[PDB]
From a paper:
Subsequently, we also solved the Nb29-α1AAR-miniGsq complex bound with noradrenaline at a global resolution of 3.5 Å. The weaker map density is in agreement with the observation that Nb29 preferentially binds to oxymetazoline-bound receptors over noradrenaline-bound receptors. The binding pocket of noradrenaline is formed by residues in TMs 3, 5, 6, and 7. The para-hydroxyl forms a hydrogen bond with S1885.42, whereas meta-hydroxyl does not form polar interaction but is close to M2926.55, a unique residue among ARs. Noradrenaline forms extensive non-polar interactions with highly conserved aromatic residues among ARs, including Y1845.38, F2886.51, and F2896.52. Noradrenaline- and oxymetazoline-bound α1AAR-miniGsq complexes are almost identical at the interfaces with miniGsq, as observed in α2AAR-Go complexes with different agonists. The ligand-binding modes of the endogenous agonist noradrenaline and the imidazoline-type agonist oxymetazoline demonstrated a key aromatic interaction involving F3127.39, which is conserved in αARs, and distinct ligand recognition by the unique residue M2926.55.
The α1A-adrenergic receptor (α1AAR) belongs to the family of G protein-coupled receptors that respond to adrenaline and noradrenaline. α1AAR is involved in smooth muscle contraction and cognitive function. Adrenergic receptors (ARs), which mediate physiological responses to the neurotransmitter noradrenaline (norepinephrine) and the hormone adrenaline (epinephrine), are family A G protein-coupled receptors (GPCRs). Our active and inactive α1AAR structures reveal the activation mechanism and distinct ligand binding modes for noradrenaline compared with other adrenergic receptor subtypes.
Author numbering:
A (entry chain A): 25 to 214, 262 to 341
B (entry chain B): 14 to 35, 51 to 137, 141 to 228
C (entry chain D): 17 to 20, 27 to 71, 76 to 83, 89 to 106
Amino acid sequence: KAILLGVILGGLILFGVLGNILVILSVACHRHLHSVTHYYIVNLAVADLLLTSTVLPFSAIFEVLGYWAFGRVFCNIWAAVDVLCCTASIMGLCIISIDRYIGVSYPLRYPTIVTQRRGLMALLCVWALSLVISIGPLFGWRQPAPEDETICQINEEPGYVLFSALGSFYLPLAIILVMYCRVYVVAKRELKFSREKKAAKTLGIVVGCFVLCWLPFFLVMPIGSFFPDFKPSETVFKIVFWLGYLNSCINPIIYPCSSQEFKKAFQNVL
Amino acid sequence: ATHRLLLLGADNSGKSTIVKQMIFETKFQVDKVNFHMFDVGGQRDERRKWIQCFNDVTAIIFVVDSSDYNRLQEALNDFKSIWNNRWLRTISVILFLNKQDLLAEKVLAKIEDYFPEFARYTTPEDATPEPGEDPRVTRAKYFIRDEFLRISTASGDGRHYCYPHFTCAVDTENARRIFNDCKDIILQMNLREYNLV
Amino acid sequence: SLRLNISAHWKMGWYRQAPGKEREFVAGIGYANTNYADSVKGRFTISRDTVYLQMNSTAVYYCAAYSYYRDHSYW
Ligand SMILES: [NH3+]C[C@H](O)c1ccc(O)c(O)c1
């Protein structure tokens, strides 16, 4: 039962990395794909690529073998790059949501409220806040860990995980839900069944996949690191730990197919 | 942020007067949004920019004098021309039924003479005139608006809209009309782009 | 010379706390592997069921038990 989980993890890894290299390759030639929302889509694509190309095979090997066969500096690199890539893609979704809200409620003053003077400052702010959360307990809140070159602990130190969970999921979840609430309000013409159901289907997936992926993990981890009366098993922990990796393979499917020119550029591969 | 409007209009139809509300390009602004309106002449002597201004536009402002019934079928022919054209067939059209104050004097004197099937049409529901309006004048105005919408509804595509308005000669609230219609055109394109409609 | 919580996938190791030195890795056995150190590669083997070492031929030791991925410990 080792090679079977290995081949399904390799299939998911290969599908995710192929989707993200197709999303990042479909923009690198077309000069028409040079707006700010295309920047905000390729930022999510490069965060999912940086996760899926490096962090995912090591976690798959760690699940097949059952022990981290590499060193200890590799584990401290791997956990930090894991947290960095996951919260960078979450805040990439947050700024995509903000861009679409100020794209559908100020349609004429949009290029005077979004400029590259400040459309590449929110990008650096979310990347810097991601690097603050990731390289937080590299000196700050790390509990003393055993000195094996075989285990590789996650950073479940309480006090840090609550700050990280709050300011890495629950504030971007609030921002995404209220801005997509405004987008759904404006997109109801504001005979009407085809106007309401066409929006409640294409925003339902872009909030449902994100909530269904990240809310199990970000709900299990702080409730288990603060209330140790729940005590989740290893199987449910690996399931909620791998849904967050599944989100970065889901995101190639949704977000270019939630546009017009991205879907044409992606369908141009075949 | 520029927005290249395209003013076709008709000759001696209040077009040059409705320009003065700040072939010759003009510019104006509303809420610090800068529209740049391209005049063309009236689609009778200058079809030169029809290749050049075919794609960069965001709307097409077609203004027509409404009082003179003798010069009415040529306007409907030009609207059927531009509404079902080739290069400018995916651009939404703003429609300005100018000189309604002249129509209020030109009615009380008949619209059924120049166009025979006026009495077959009546004043419909969901219509709201201004305060103190004669029903025959509103019936004639909505009759020619319904004629322009009958020409407008002859494509079956839903790829480009049409926004009609009843403007007088010296109305000051007409730049906000083009502002709101350009906002609605760009918002429909934004909702089509994000796969929301 | 001297020989010297309960889970399933939890690893169980033995460390040596020397005078003034830091906690150096000495031995460990788990459900997935069994790792040793260079200092006790031949002079001390391990035994698991309780978990204890078995040395043959630097005086204080610590028997520990921990996880592979979650940040737990039992010293
Ligand atoms: N798989 C998710 C990734 O391991 C992650 C993301 C955010 C965290 O706060 C974390 O501890 C771990």
